[PDB]
From a paper:
Mammalian ATG8 proteins comprise two subfamilies, namely LC3s (LC3A, LC3B, and LC3C) and GABARAPs (GABARAP, GABARAP-L1, and GABARAP-L2). The canonical LIR motif is a small Θ0-X1-X2-Γ3 motif, where Θ represents an aromatic residue (W/F/Y) and Γ an aliphatic residue (L/V/I) (whose side chains bind to hydrophobic pocket 1 (HP1) and HP2 of the LIR docking site (LDS), respectively) and X represents any amino acid (aa). In this study, we examined the molecular determinants that regulate selective binding of the centriolar satellite (CS) marker protein PCM1 (pericentriolar material 1) and the ULK1 complex to GABARAPs.
We recently showed that the CS protein PCM1 binds directly to GABARAP through a canonical LIR motif regulating GABARAP-specific autophagosome formation and GABARAP stability. To elucidate the molecular basis of the PCM1-GABARAP interaction, we determined the crystal structure of the PCM11951–1964 LIR motif bound to GABARAP. The structure was solved in two different space groups P212121 and P43 at a resolution of 1.55 and 1.86 Å, respectively. Notably, the adjacent C-terminal region engaged in multiple interactions: (1) a salt bridge between E1959PCM1 (X4) and R28GAB, (2) a large hydrophobic contact between L1961PCM1 (X6) and L55GAB, F62GAB, L63GAB, and (3) two hydrogen bonds between the side chain of Q59GAB and the main chain of P1962PCM1 (X7), as well as K1964PCM1 (X9) through a water molecule. Why is the X2 LIR residue of PCM1 affecting binding to LC3s more than GABARAPs? Both M359ULK1 and M446ATG13 (position X2 in the ULK1 and ATG13 LIRs) form hydrophobic interactions with Y25GAB and L50GAB, whereas the charged and longer side chain of K1957PCM1 only partially engages with the hydrophobic surface of GABARAP. Whereas mutation of the GIM motif residues (X1 and Γ3) had opposing or only mild effects, mutation of the lysine in position X2 (K1957IPCM1) dramatically increased both LC3 subfamily (LC3B: 95-fold; LC3A/LC3C: 75- and 47-fold, respectively) and GABARAP subfamily (~12-fold) binding.
Numbering used by the authors: -13 to 117
Write the structure that this text describes.
């Protein structure tokens, strides 16, 4: 076979969240409902590493963030927890799309939260999962 075999790129929708494998729907839905009632100005977020990414692991998965925090500021928060420089690449994906840095986390949540009331974000060193 004379071909360049393309086997190292992540195909759409292949992401799987450990958080959802380990905690069943009714228990996530329960907690997400409660936290959204108790803190209406904040959103609950799950962050895990995208398929095939080459990048440092994240220590913590679950974040409770102000609705008015921007995506650009959440990139800063995550960079710091993984000990990346500002010059090191980092991309987020929500429902397989790269969100704009100008959006707020509250806008992302309203448009994209799942039915357990959490917003799910994947991260990588490259953009390709979202293209």
């Amino acid at each position: 076979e004379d071909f360049v075999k393309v086997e190292d790129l992540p195909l759409k929708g292949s992401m799987k969240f450990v958080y959802k494998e380990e905690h069943p729907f009714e228990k996530r839905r329960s907690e997400g409902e409660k936290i959204r009632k108790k803190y209406p100005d904040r959103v609950p977020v799950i962050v895990e590493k995208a398929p095939k990414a080459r990048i440092g692991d994240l220590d913590k998965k679950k974040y409770l963030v102000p609705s008015d925090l921007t995506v650009g500021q959440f990139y800063f928060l995550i960079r710091k927890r993984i000990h990346l420089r500002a010059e090191d690449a980092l991309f987020f994906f929500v429902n397989n799309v790269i969100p704009p840095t100008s959006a707020t986390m509250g806008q992302l949540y309203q448009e994209h939260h799942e039915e357990d009331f959490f917003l799910y974000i994947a991260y990588s060193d490259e953009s390709v999962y979202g293209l």
